[PDB]
Amino acid sequence: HTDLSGKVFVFPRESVTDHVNLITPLEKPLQNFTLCFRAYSDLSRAYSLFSYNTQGRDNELLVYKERVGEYSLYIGRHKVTSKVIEKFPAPVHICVSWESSSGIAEFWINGTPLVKKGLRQGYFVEAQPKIVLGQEQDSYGGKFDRSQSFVGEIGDLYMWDSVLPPENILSAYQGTPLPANILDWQALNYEIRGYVIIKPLVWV
Amino acid sequence: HTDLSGKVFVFPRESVTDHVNLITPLEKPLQNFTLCFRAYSDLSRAYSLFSYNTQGRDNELLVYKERVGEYSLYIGRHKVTSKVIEKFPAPVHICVSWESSSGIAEFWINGTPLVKKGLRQGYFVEAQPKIVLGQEQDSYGGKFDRSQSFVGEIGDLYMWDSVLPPENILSAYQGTPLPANILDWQALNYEIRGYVIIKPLVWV
Amino acid sequence: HTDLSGKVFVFPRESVTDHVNLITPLEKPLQNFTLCFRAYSDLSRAYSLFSYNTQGRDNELLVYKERVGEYSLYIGRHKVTSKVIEKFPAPVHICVSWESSSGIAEFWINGTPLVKKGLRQGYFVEAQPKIVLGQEQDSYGGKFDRSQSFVGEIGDLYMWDSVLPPENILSAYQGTPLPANILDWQALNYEIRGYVIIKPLVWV
Amino acid sequence: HTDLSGKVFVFPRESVTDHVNLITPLEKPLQNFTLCFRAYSDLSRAYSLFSYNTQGRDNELLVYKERVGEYSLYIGRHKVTSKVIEKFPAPVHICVSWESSSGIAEFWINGTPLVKKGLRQGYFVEAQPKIVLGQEQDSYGGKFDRSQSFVGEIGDLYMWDSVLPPENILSAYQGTPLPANILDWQALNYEIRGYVIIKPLVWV
Amino acid sequence: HTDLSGKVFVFPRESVTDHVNLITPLEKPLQNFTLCFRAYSDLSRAYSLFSYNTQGRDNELLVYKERVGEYSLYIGRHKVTSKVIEKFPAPVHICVSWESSSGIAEFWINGTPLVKKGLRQGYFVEAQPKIVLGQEQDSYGGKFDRSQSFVGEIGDLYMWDSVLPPENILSAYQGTPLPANILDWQALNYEIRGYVIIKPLVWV
Numbered sequence A, B, C, D, E: 001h002t003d004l005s006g007k008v009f010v011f012p013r014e015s016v017t018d019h020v021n022l023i024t025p026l027e028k029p030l031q032n033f034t035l036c037f038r039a040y041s042d043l044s045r046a047y048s049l050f051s052y053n054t055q056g057r058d059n060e061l062l063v064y065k066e067r068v069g070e071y072s073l074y075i076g077r078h079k080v081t082s083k084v085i086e087k088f089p090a091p092v093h094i095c096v097s098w099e100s101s102s103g104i105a106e107f108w109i110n111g112t113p114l115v116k117k118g119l120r121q122g123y124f125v126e127a128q129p130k131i132v133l134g135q136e137q138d139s140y141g142g143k144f145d146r147s148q149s150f151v152g153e154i155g156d157l158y159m160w161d162s163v164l165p166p167e168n169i170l171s172a173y174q175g176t177p178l179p180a181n182i183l184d185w186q187a188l189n190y191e192i193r194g195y196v197i198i199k200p201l202v203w204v
């Protein structure tokens, strides 16, 4: 694994091929999770931030930016959407959690909680995923779409198999995240495919 | 009866069936009242915040958000509306009072008094209500309308059979409400129907 | 008379009949005057703030809000209009003075002087007026127009038979007006006609 | 001469006749100058601020406001224009300088330098002007145009036969102008024609 | 060489001829560079800020302002574009760096980093350039276009044959740049062609 503290992936151009694969040994279906990361893009079209597909299942867990001020989460191909006041262009810190028992999904944008939504109560997110940054998967690992590609910078990505309490979400926003057991930016296993460059983070 | 201090009802999806019934023993018609609560929604269409119907009488006491910055109160099916500068989306704290003797209705939004309006001077709000959060009633307890449903979070709801002076309204807004004899968040008798989840309040 | 310190007139609904008559001991034509008051309304259409008519003479002295940010003064049926940056809805403190010798009219909005205009140099405003709040007169005392009615709250009204220097205007704005010899809120003679309610001032 | 310290000319109405003539025994052609003054108008159409014509020469030196945020200088009938962020309506302090040697024209608006422009390098502004406030001259002293008339207040007008450095512009802006040898508000020779009233300056 | 500390080039008018040539002894192809300068213009159409062409190669290194809030860099006739929130008109400090090994291009606008883009990975910028301010070259030293001309002021220009770290970019922004080996405002070799005037910098 590699410690990417203080660094970002730069997806420096639009394409249907540039991407990063994130590797996790996740074998157990997820009942709960929290996912946090920081991103900086000047795209105004929609784009995928985090794409997690499993065999036979598109949009099994997907974080997708619809337009300025509007974020969607998909769980098992069902979607919820939440709104927020934001500037454009601007760096953003995004957390999202989901809890099967209640179905509640919660976005936090720059440490501010969005209105809670709910979906897929009782569902388990399937395991053995392919996880992709920079492109949105329609297949198990592929079938990308140029108009959903992420162009810009991503970093500080963590994913936990629990629902973090607010204090721990704020800690992540402030730059001291709890160590994470699904994905952890400070101990990350990844594969760059195509034109993706690792650079220091200069915009926090 | 349940103490919901520090908690909210989450109506996590749009529907024509998800709702909470609030039970009060109120039997004497009301000359005066004050109603306070906090809400957080990213709907921009109109929606009902607090729906109180009596037998044979639609919109007997209704707090209805027309659009961003515009709030209506119905008394006995007659309406007044007042405007305020506000951000969107954003949590809101709302108090509203009405006094039969003068007919005066006063909204307070995030501690700001709106322009006073007046209606139903001399009227008495009927008692033995059905009170619903999450949907707007057109019947005694039912006949909901998807396009009036409330999607989002509501908490800290109190209702008194008198007009609170401004200092007591600010106390509610600050988080130190007087005890309340019609509805009280710290001793609430409620019935969840459909998809409504109780969660901690994280947005005040 | 009546001491309305700390209180406002509330015109709680649109109508063509609700109004207040103000009674002045004014037997002499006016060469100079200053008029100050506070108002709070969420109307965006035009409306009359202060209507003073004499026999055979419509708009003999009239303060009329044309639209957000635009105020007009009529003297002997002639009009001037001045603009200002303001928020909507918002309480406002308005002073207006006029003097025959120069014809100069000056509005002050929330203690800010508007651009001076001029009209009716050499003219004397006629005596023996009917003075009305809540409606715009077209006759001596009447002939109202619903689309010119004032809905909202008015308080702290004073009128002097001289042109106040700026430091006295600012004293009025801050809540310490000099004693006033035409109309005085602390010693006011008035009649309520229709639906007008007196309430405490809560927005200053 | 007259000392107008603390006072303004008020042009209280739109007309094609109201104006002030400024008198200066300017007998030698001008190679360099700076002109400063304060103005307050809520016109949104174009208008002349300072009109200097010589025999057979229209727009020999003219300061003209095109629209909110846009100011023009004419030298010998040729024009430059520069833009600025400004509020409307609002008082403004305006300085403009021009230098034959380089042709450079500087506007300063509320103490802020606009982008430099250039025109008429090597030219001499003709002597023996008629100088008018309130109207734009097309002839030697006349041929006004109602739609270019200045309605509002003008004060603190100074004109120097040199290009003032920045600190001298700050000095004028803050109400402490350097002594001036072409026109000086504290020793001004002027002629009022029509409806122009001298009043105290209350908006600084 | 000339020390232009505290001075700017003023391009006082639109034209297809006014320009400055910048002379550098650059003989080896450039792998990496940083370019910083300050500019002030009230043009809203597109314009060239810095035009570097080599024999037979248009837009070999070009910094081009597309519209308010949008900056482009060309390397070997390929383009990237980044967006920023900015006021108009307003002075600006611009740095841009590019590195062949990664292809990464980074704009800094008033010390704020824009989203990184990438182009021309592995390419070397050709040497023996003609470098022009005030006009956009389509040939080696010429073939200008009036609608791409720069009207306004430019100063404090430095170019280095390395990618400056962030703290050094802030140094340049604040007025204490590192000495620079390709172009240096304190030791600049330049030629004025047409109407370009050197004046003190008054807008920092």
Ligand SMILES: *[C@@H]1O[C@H](CO)[C@@H](O[C@@H]2O[C@H](CO)[C@@H](O[C@@H]3O[C@H](CO[C@H]4O[C@H](CO)[C@@H](O)[C@H](O)[C@@H]4O[C@@H]4O[C@H](CO)[C@@H](O[C@H]5O[C@H](CO[C@]6(C(=O)O)C[C@H](O)[C@@H](NC(C)=O)[C@H]([C@H](O)[C@H](O)CO)O6)[C@H](O)[C@H](O)[C@H]5O)[C@H](O)[C@H]4NC(C)=O)[C@@H](O)[C@H](O[C@H]4O[C@H](CO)[C@@H](O)[C@H](O)[C@@H]4O[C@@H]4O[C@H](CO)[C@@H](O[C@@H]5O[C@H](CO[C@]6(C(=O)O)C[C@H](O)[C@@H](NC(C)=O)[C@H]([C@H](O)[C@H](O)CO)O6)[C@H](O)[C@H](O)[C@H]5O)[C@H](O)[C@H]4NC(C)=O)[C@@H]3O)[C@H](O)[C@H]2NC(C)=O)[C@H](O)[C@H]1NC(C)=O
Residues within 6 Å of the ligand: B031, B032, B099, B100, B101, B161, B162, C002, C189, C190, C191, C192, C193
């Ligand atoms: C909801 O809410 C509501 C509201 O809030 C409520 O209600 C309320 O309530 C409350 C409580 O209850 C109340 O209070 C009260 O008050 C009162 C007053 O009133 C008033 O005010 C108020 C205020 O707010 C109000 O509200 C009311 O309403 C009123 O007001 C008014 O109204 C009216 C109507 O009616 C109106 O009308 C008028 O006016 C009009 C108009 O005007 C005008 C105009 O505008 O325009 C003006 C102007 O200037 C003019 N101008 C010229 C130029 O002129 C004009 C003209 O004129 C025309 O226009 C033409 O041109 O005009 C007209 O004017 C007409 O005409 C008139 O009429 C009016 O306006 C109004 N005003 C105002 C100001 O606004 C009071 O009074 C009361 O009192 C009390 O107080 C306290 C508190 O502070 C209490 O607590 C208590 O009660 C008290 O006390 C007392 O004392 C007394 C005395 O001092 C007494 O008496 C005594 O007694 C004694 C003893 O006894 C004996 C005998 O008998 O003798 C002894 C022996 O020994 C023994 N024996 C043995 C063997 O032992 C015996 C035995 O015991 C016995 O008998 C028994 O059996 O005893 C002796 O007698 C001695 O002598 C005496 O003195 C008493 O008793 C006591 N009491 C008690 C109980 O204690 C109170 O305060 C209120 O009122 C109400 N309100 C209503 C509305 O309702 C409710 O409640 C709620 N709900 C629920 C359910 O909760």
Ligand SMILES: *[C@@H]1O[C@H](CO)[C@@H](O[C@@H]2O[C@H](CO)[C@@H](O)[C@H](O)[C@H]2NC(C)=O)[C@H](O)[C@H]1NC(C)=O
Residues within 6 Å of the ligand: E031, E032, E099, E101, E161
């Ligand atoms: C341009 O920058 C590149 C990248 O920083 C420089 O290449 C590096 O050179 C150093 C030592 O000279 C090595 O440690 C790196 O591994 C090199 N990186 C790569 C990708 O080649 C390069 O030297 C710079 N060029 C010039 C002319 O200074």
Ligand SMILES: O=C(O)[C@H]1CCCN1C(=O)CCCCC(=O)N1CCC[C@@H]1C(=O)O
Residues within 6 Å of the ligand: A058, A059, A062, A064, A136, A137, A138, A145, A148
């Ligand atoms: O791409 C996805 O998997 C989902 C998740 C993000 C948004 N999205 C969709 O909008 C579903 C469809 C994406 C592709 C698309 O826009 N179209 C339009 C017609 C053909 C094709 C399709 O739906 O299959």
Ligand SMILES: O=C(O)[C@H]1CCCN1C(=O)CCCCC(=O)N1CCC[C@@H]1C(=O)O
Residues within 6 Å of the ligand: B058, B059, B062, B064, B136, B137, B138, B145, B148
């Ligand atoms: O729903 C209510 O009881 C009141 C209170 C909130 C707003 N409202 C209304 O707008 C009244 C009518 C709502 C339903 C509606 O829009 N229509 C349109 C035609 C049929 C139906 C109706 O009025 O019955």
Ligand SMILES: O=C(O)[C@H]1CCCN1C(=O)CCCCC(=O)N1CCC[C@@H]1C(=O)O
Residues within 6 Å of the ligand: C058, C059, C062, C064, C136, C137, C138, C145, C148
């Ligand atoms: O009402 C007044 O006395 C004055 C003062 C306020 C504006 N106004 C006007 O006259 C403006 C026009 C308002 C509408 C109106 O009164 N109309 C429109 C046509 C018939 C009737 C009229 O002018 O008599």
Ligand SMILES: O=C(O)[C@H]1CCCN1C(=O)CCCCC(=O)N1CCC[C@@H]1C(=O)O
Residues within 6 Å of the ligand: D058, D059, D062, D064, D136, D137, D138, D145, D148
């Ligand atoms: O009035 C001036 O001397 C100059 C200076 C300010 C603007 N202007 C212009 O000439 C602009 C055009 C204004 C309108 C005008 O004067 N017109 C319009 C056509 C006939 C007449 C003319 O140019 O002579």
Ligand SMILES: O=C(O)[C@H]1CCCN1C(=O)CCCCC(=O)N1CCC[C@@H]1C(=O)O
Residues within 6 Å of the ligand: E058, E059, E062, E064, E136, E137, E138, E145, E148
């Ligand atoms: O001028 C350049 O070299 C490049 C760099 C800056 C922007 N630009 C262009 O937009 C290329 C086109 C410039 C000239 C132009 O707009 N046209 C339009 C048709 C003919 C002519 C051309 O492309 O040759």
Ligand SMILES: *[C@@H]1O[C@H](CO)[C@@H](O)[C@H](O)[C@H]1NC(C)=O
Residues within 6 Å of the ligand: A031, A032, A099, A101, A162, A163
């Ligand atoms: C999911 O998180 C919540 C929080 O307590 C709870 O429903 C459950 O225990 C968690 N599930 C698992 C399997 O860890």
Ligand SMILES: *[C@@H]1O[C@H](CO)[C@@H](O)[C@H](O)[C@H]1NC(C)=O
Residues within 6 Å of the ligand: C031, C032, C099, C101
């Ligand atoms: C009005 O003010 C003028 C100008 O100062 C003054 O001459 C006159 O006395 C005033 N009128 C009255 C009635 O006092």
Ligand SMILES: *[C@@H]1O[C@H](CO)[C@@H](O)[C@H](O)[C@H]1NC(C)=O
Residues within 6 Å of the ligand: D031, D032, D099, D101, D161
């Ligand atoms: C105008 O300024 C120029 C350039 O600074 C100077 O040389 C000239 O003497 C000035 N003209 C006069 C008449 O003062």
